[PDB]
């Protein structure tokens, strides 16, 4: 575990490549990409204030640093300081880091990381740089500042979490879960949308703690401009403690953001992006999430669009509670010849939801065409870059007009044989074989049917239903379903800490589970000495991958530190349960003499055993989402999902050689966009950690350290809660 | 909502 909290010297990097794409759109195309990624761009380091207390300070002092001098210039005063340079090198893969994460913690796994090097070294290499001979005390004034919760080794600050556990800035330093799941209950009778908003606690001289729900917006509570979130802000009491609803969350960033898409609107190809944008002003001005609900309607009611947009507070996966959203803004080209082959399994896509393991009533009322592109991304601000999504976010809008799936194709084209650690020389080489062919296939159901199935039972304010009642019953029961969602209640505001996992395993689930069948097959132009391999290495992968999950498993904390790795960890303990050999796990020995393990997926029993599992499973999950039950999807997951040293696999003692034969994921560079006026072009770097600072100290030429004199005041205002 | 690489 010392290397968990560090990141390699040797850590892949790859160049995000979209030129073409970007060369095809004609100027007005290209602006209105163009204002959306300085948007989003802007946007984007709001992570570091949603990330750690000491991140902005972090990002601040870095970016001077490396405008002072870039690698190749302060690489001399660094080595020339006493520095080796496998020290420096590691500093600037900590950067790179930094600046990929939007923060200090990994957005993978939720985890701290440090500089690899000795801290009076470069205590050094900050304070004798160029930078600190200009500014002497700015660097000072920061380094003083974050130094040490940079390098901070810590217990409780090595992961993300509430409570004395973790490091979560989504709420103030003394907040439990308790508060969350109080304060959430609030949220949900006045209906306040938990994406956009923050928690602090507050005491006084007696022990009575007073709440502080603060939103995102550009504009602070002042004399209204008479919107919804007007009459919001105010005093309020629930149950012995004060609720106080307040906006300007990160103020000046939102102004940035508002004014780069109000001059996104203009070029809008048309009416839908020039009003939806608007409408998204209007969210991230007001603090209103409505504003943002339907500019996310316009948003499927285009279609088929040239350049590809999105932002806002959006997946909830970073939040300790679960609900509270992480900013994020992407800016992408449609490709059109991939998207075609994915267009067909939207056209096919009708029939197959009737194949799930639930009936037809248990499913969304009607369908759609809602979308399905493969996207060259331009820019993707954050914390991290998704290979395919589904949104928006909001799920009654799944259900009752859309949604629309995104396959980035160019992510791809970055990540693709003794890394392929717990196979056979067998396997592996199906794996190298199918793996990127067989991506596509789990991408396109993990995101099509994977959250496109399914459908929600609400209780309208009225005793009346979203259905018809005497006529749905449950499977597993029998009887009439005595269960469901209610006014202001929401997948996240129910399942909260599970939702997300859940969520995702289920969509996995259906990933497999179409994945056997052969029509899906024939659209990727799979059959025959074809349509096994692919298949095979997919469930392959996934067991694997529920083994991997180890790793980002907190056995301490008896916690898991992602929705994705954990659902796959419980995919994987469903197989093993169902048992007949089809799955075996060995605590074999590397080469290397060290410990080791091989995955043992019998291919044969695929259809015998697996299946029947997967789909009963299936039929599980969705009957308890339905109805939205939580004690049951709890008993039924948390057990499923518990880990612990019991034989014939003992996962507790397997984590072990997961984390030595552990992998730090690669870091992808992005291009920016320069503005010449009437003409605007594209600046690539190479792919490493160099190019990546290079990418970073080149993203904001006008207001760069303004924007950082910004993340600094915002972080000392509230710099009281942690 | 994300499936990641």
Redesign the interface.
Known sequence: ADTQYILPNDIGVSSLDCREAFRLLSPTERLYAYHLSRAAWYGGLAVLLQTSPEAPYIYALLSRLFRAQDPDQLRQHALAEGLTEEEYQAFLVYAAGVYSNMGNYKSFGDTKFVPNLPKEKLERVILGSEAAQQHPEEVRGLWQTCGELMFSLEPRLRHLGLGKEGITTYFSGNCTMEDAKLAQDFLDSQNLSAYNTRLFKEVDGEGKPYYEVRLASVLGSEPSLDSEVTSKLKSYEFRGSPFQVTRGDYAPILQKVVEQLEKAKAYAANSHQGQMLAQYIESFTQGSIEAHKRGSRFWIQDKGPIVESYIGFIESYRDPFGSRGEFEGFVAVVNKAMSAKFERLVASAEQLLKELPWPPTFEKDKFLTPDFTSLDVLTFAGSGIPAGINIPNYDDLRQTEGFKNVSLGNVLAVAYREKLTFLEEDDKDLYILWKGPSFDVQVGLHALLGHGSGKLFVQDEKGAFNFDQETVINPETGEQIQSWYRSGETWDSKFSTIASSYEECRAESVGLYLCLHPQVLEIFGFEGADAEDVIYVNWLNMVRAGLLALEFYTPEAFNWRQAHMQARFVILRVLLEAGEGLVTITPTTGSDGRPDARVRLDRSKIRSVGKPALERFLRRLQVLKSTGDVAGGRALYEGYATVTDAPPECFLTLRDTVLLRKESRKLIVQPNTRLEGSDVQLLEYEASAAGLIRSFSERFPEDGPELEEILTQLATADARFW | ?5
């Open positions: 909502v994300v499936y990641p690489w």
